[PDB]
Paper text:
The large superfamily of labdane-related diterpenoids is defined by the cyclization of linear geranylgeranyl pyrophosphate (GGPP), catalyzed by copalyl diphosphate synthases (CPSs) to form the basic decalin core, the copalyl diphosphates (CPPs). Here, we used X-ray crystallography and cryo-EM methods to describe different oligomeric structures of a syn-copalyl diphosphate synthase from Oryza sativa (OsCyc1), and provided a cryo-EM structure of OsCyc1D367A mutant in complex with the substrate GGPP.
Next, we determined the crystal structure of OsCyc169–767 by molecular replacement method at 3.5 Å resolution, which contains six protomers (Chains A/B/C/D/E/F) in the asymmetric unit. The overall structure of monomer OsCyc1 is similar to that of AtCPS, AgAS and SmMDS, with RMSD values for Cα of 1.86 Å, 2.15 Å and 1.94 Å, respectively. Residues located within or near α22 interact with residues in α25, such as Q627 with R720, which are at a hydrogen bonding distance in the crystal structure. The interactions between α23 and α24 include R652 with Q675, as well as E640 with K686, possibly through van der Waals interactions. In addition, we found that H-bonds form between S674 and E677 within the α24 helix. When we analyzed the binding interactions in the crystal structure, we found that the interactions between different dimers are similar. The interaction between dimer C/D and dimer E/F is identical to the interaction between dimer A/B and dimer C/D, suggesting that a pseudo-twofold symmetry axis exists between the chains C and D. In addition to the abovementioned interactions in the center of the hexamer, a linkage exists in the γ domain of protomer B and protomer E, which protrude to the edge of the crystal hexamer structure.
Numbering used by the authors:
A (entry chain B): 81 to 116, 121 to 184, 195 to 452, 457 to 694, 696 to 767
B (entry chain A): 79 to 767
The structure:
């Protein structure tokens, strides 16, 4: 409990960003001379963050580009100000011996050229040096200088290595805070070249905000929120921070642009990674968002990361787009349709290859996203897996320096999640152990599977994988119980021929569900209808699965005790229409599992193609958080259907390997 | 006036009772033969003879003046003689018409094989014996009789001492002539009013031979309430009610008497037995004609009834009219069960299913035939009644069509009934019923044309013909006609036109929507299109939402396989309910579910319906279509259940609205366009009177 409050106070205090200080950008800001050093606290930061091998940068992850480039950039500060020559050469040793990332081949050449303007014994004569110094010109050539001055671009992030540019038409391109694409390095060098006080103002605040020392990117108010939400959400503890999450999710909605989302509010250049993350979470949490904001990253069928700079697209952004395409609504622009296909192909061509590199388990995160589309993504399934995939402090981010995200790439995030999940597994085992008794002492295993522990186990598991909450135990057990009766009864009819020869008064049977003073009567009425559905759908070809599901949501709605006001006309329609979809969607599923007869891949792929279709209009009506039906009622429909889909799209082998991994393979 | 005629039928319906039936000369003169109880020499009921004298027909016959039947005139005519002569009074008129028997007796040989009177072959030979005794000049040696005489004896072979005297049979109706019977075991058999199978005649013979004063009360009861004179069967409290309802219902004017009908329909529910129904409350032998009528009308009017009472009349594969006795089945009783078999619910005992199958076949063997005469009724247009129910099953039976047709089929005062004598039922087979129904129907047609011109104007004024059907002129006509054939009432104009308008708009938009391929290529908004349908401001809020919801359904069901015909049906019923401004006030959980299910079934039925009408002209296969026809028919039963079960908490009017919309979709899919406008012509344009 203390931990939840820990994450809460961290989220309530959300802001510009929790980022690690970058050694390179801090010393490059140290290089700015008094307006009459200008930030002696940049230097005061520098002296202390020296690693024992005499080097700099990220300590916990050793990277060549990072330890070298961060180390020397601190050196070019200490010696060019002729102070602390003790550590200055002590780290000059590190550079010499280990001489054998973003903007690396642009900021490093201007940093050696800057190393020449001082004296510093460093192997410039490196065979590795010529290969990346050649790419200096291999890129400064494909960049059109007259285009770098016309529209804000990703290049403006590396102006320390840029030579002889028109600042008259460049200051027109900065971010809203005055920064040059949010690099303090690019703004320091832009200030050495022009004294724009709004371009200074970005810099001083960044050092004031950190009491010395400055990161490699700022601010990142959007990226951080979006990703902190997705992370808490996947970890299953999102329910604890509902006001805080909906607090900053609002912020993302406020700053939605028709051109997409950037990593910060005040960056005019947008990227697909942030837009897809934003689009998914905004739609997932019930906001009105239009996916057409994506066609800004489509150029002739292909999907890049920036609007124009057709760079090679990385792996993580395509994952995040693929996920956003999974919340496809039928009324949406086709761009989301095209996006799904492209991103699936991108990640499939790469799945069978270790070319999944960009974080702890990025292939596992991706296998899931591809093997379990939305219709079959049960939140506890994803969450159990995600505990074994979330990197914690292990995740590192590739910027100008190696940097880390304090707020959402946290170790407290895991300790909290694995706690809340263990208590779920504990509450789950006691839950079913109580269920097993209930099943047996009812002469109820005589009906059902030829191994009723298996028909019980999956029937309880589905309900708990979806309605997993602490207190919602009333509903969960109700779902499991009613499910078992329905399975039992369907089994009895299947090997007897129908209610035609129902010798018994099997209406009763609900009295196997314990009497609640508010629950029992209405549950009798719903169960009566499921029976009445059998005798009518009996001597025909329509399946009953549609009505089995419809009964379920009816009970789950009786437990948990919310009713649908029926005087209001649109309240009636939205409910009555949700039932139609669930009745229709589960009936089509039961037709696919019959064609798996077992022949015609062409025919099965037709049924799948249209179930996905009807699922979209359901997913729309369930998430559309303005609809006149209670969000919990809407979730109840989504829960039942997803579980039905889950079952219909999964081998019994895969299904209980999940059961073992979520309920029994204890975390912590 | 129209109001008076409705009041005429009404005040008569309030005064319903034991029967309004016509007097029988035969049953009456047989009661004059009963000598005074107080040991006096005047006949016990002198008012029977008072009646005799007054109604001798001009040819000296007796019986039905308006309908001449030989069998009818002989038995009623001589029975009056064997009365008048047996008291040796009025021998002057006794003779005039004694010759009628003399001259026309030979003609007994011509009668229509099919409709011979009841107990004719038992009660007429019994009447030679009473004439022989009074010694009358009669052709007892008529060769025409030998055929009925000796086929009495073989008729009178199914008499056993053991069965006639242990459990009641219909022979008890005609024991006027019967020898060597043991009344001690026979009185244990009669009906509750004391009659012998409700025959005043048979009860008189049972009185000459048994002084049973608790059975006399029955005869005195008839003679007081009919002021002398006596019907050929009494009482008819169940039959008369059942038939008055079916007639007023098919004549389309049931609604004016909703209270009156629901009164005596209650009278039937109270007296429903697991053995079936008879024509009276107090007759232990039940018959399929009354039992079938009661079941249908009861289930039609929202009563809980179980068809399993029908297997009381199933005798291994066949459907007779009585429980014990297996007899040649007549036409009207099979028609009336067949009509009842149309209301099968999916929960029913199977016998109602099988009966449908039998009488369909029974009536088919007979449709292509001279045989269509009934043994029970002689009605103006009896095959037309059978035509419709045979061609138009429940799902496609629109109430205004049936009623239009029935107006030219109801015989009115012309219908005559076959008992021991020809008798008539004045109450529900009269001319005021027809005069009234045609009135209520003409005022329906007049208002129909007036509305039509409003539709024609409205369709124009909205420019919606730009993309109607091919000829929007008939897509208008039919879409009004479907709505008017169903919601036809006086007041309901609000809903009807709204139905027609919303149907036209919806179809119009769907037409254009197909033209271009979906909203993907739609430059237009269309959301505000309903403002083309007139509407009060204290209503526009919900009609917009229903339409917006329908469009959302379009965008979903596009580039998919499911049709929208379901959702257009939902849209209509949703719209009609808005125009009638009733919503489901606030119900418990099963109220919501029950509504949600009607929407489900309606949408599901109409998709399945529009799945055959494209697989019609496409990949034929009679068996592939019977798969769809089966699948639609099933859903209809569960829906027909959910509409008609009058215990439900959803308003009657909401449920009926679902049936109207679905029935109209059915009518269209199952009707040749050639026939469909013949109906349109006949109900809206081919005016009655």
């Amino acid at each position: 409990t203390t931990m939840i409050d820990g994450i809460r106070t961290a989220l309530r205090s959300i802001g510009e960003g929790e980022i690690s200080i970058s050694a390179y950008d801090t010393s490059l800001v140290a290089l700015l001379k008094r307006l009459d050093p200008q930030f002696p606290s940049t230097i005061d930061w520098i002296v202390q963050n020296q690693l024992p091998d005499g080097s700099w940068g990220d300590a916990s992850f050793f990277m060549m580009g990072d330890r070298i480039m961060s180390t020397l950039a601190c050196v070019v500060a200490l010696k060019s100000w002729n102070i602390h020559t003790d550590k200055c050469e002590r780290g000059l040793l590190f550079i010499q011996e280990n001489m054998w990332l973003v903007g690396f081949e642009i900021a490093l050449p201007s940093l050696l050229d800057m190393a020449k303007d001082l004296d510093l014994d460093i192997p410039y004569d490196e065979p590795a040096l010529k290969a990346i110094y050649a790419e200096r010109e291999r890129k400064l050539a494909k960049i059109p200088r007259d285009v770098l001055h016309s529209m804000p671009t990703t290049l403006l992030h590396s102006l320390e290595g840029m030579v002889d540019l028109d600042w008259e038409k460049l200051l027109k391109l900065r971010c809203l805070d005055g920064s040059f694409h949010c690099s303090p390095a690019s703004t320091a060098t832009a200030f050495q070249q022009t004294g724009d006080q709004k371009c200074f103002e970005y810099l001083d605040g960044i050092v004031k905000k950190f009491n010395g020392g400055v990161p490699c990117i700022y601010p990142l108010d959007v990226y951080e929120r979006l990703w902190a939400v997705d992370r808490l959400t996947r970890l299953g503890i999102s329910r604890h921070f509902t006001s805080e999450i909906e607090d900053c999710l609002d912020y993302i909605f406020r700053n939605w642009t028709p051109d997409g989302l950037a990593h910060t509010k005040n960056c005019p250049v947008k990227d697909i990674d942030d837009t897809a993350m934003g689009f998914r979470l905004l739609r997932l949490y019930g906001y009105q968002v239009d996916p057409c904001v994506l066609k800004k990253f489509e150029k002739d069928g292909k999907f890049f990361c920036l609007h124009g700079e057709s760079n090679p697209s990385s792996v993580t952004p395509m994952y995040n787009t693929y996920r956003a395409s999974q919340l496809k609504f039928p009324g949406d622009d086709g761009v989301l349709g095209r996006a799904e296909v492209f991103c699936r192909s991108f990640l499939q061509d790469r799945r069978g290859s270790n070319r999944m590199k960009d974080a702890k388990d990025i292939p596992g995160e991706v296998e899931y996203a591809m093997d379990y589309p939305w219709k079959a993504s049960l939140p506890r399934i994803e969450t159990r897996l995600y505990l074994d995939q979330y990197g914690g402090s292990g995740d590192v981010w590739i910027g100008k320096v190696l940097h880390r995200m304090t707020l959402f790439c946290n170790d407290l995030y895991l300790k909290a999640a694995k706690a809340d999940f263990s208590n779920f597994q504990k509450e789950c085992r006691v839950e079913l152990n109580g269920l097993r008794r209930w099943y047996l002492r009812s002469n109820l295993e005589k009906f059902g599977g030829t191994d009723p522990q298996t028909t019980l186990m999956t029937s309880y598991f589905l309900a708990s994988a979806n309605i997993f909450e602490a207190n919602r135990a009333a509903e969960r057990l109700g779902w499991a119980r009613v499910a078992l009766l329905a399975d039992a009864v369907s089994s009895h009819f299947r090997r007897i021929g129908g209610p035609k020869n129902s010798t018994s008064n099997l209406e009763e049977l609900i009295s196997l569900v314990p009497f609640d003073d508010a629950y029992s009567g209405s549950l009798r009425e719903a169960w009566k209808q499921w029976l009445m559905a059998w005798t009518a759908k009996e001597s025909s070809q329509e399946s009953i699965e549609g009505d089995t599901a419809i009964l379920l949501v009816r009970a789950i709605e009786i437990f948990g005790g919310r009713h649908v006001l029926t005087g209001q006309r649109p309240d009636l329609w939205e409910y009555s229409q949700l039932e139609q979809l669930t009745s229709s969607i589960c009936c089509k599923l039961s037709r696919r599992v019959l064609a798996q007869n077992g022949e015609s891949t062409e025919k099965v792929e037709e049924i799948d193609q249209q179930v996905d279709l009807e699922m979209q209009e359901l997913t729309r009506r369930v998430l559309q958080g303005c609809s006149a039906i209670n969000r919990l009622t809407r979730e109840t429909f989504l829960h039942v259907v997803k579980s039905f889909c889950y079952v219909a799209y999964c081998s019994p082998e895969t299904i209980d390997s999940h059961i073992d991994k979520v309920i029994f393979q204890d975390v912590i």
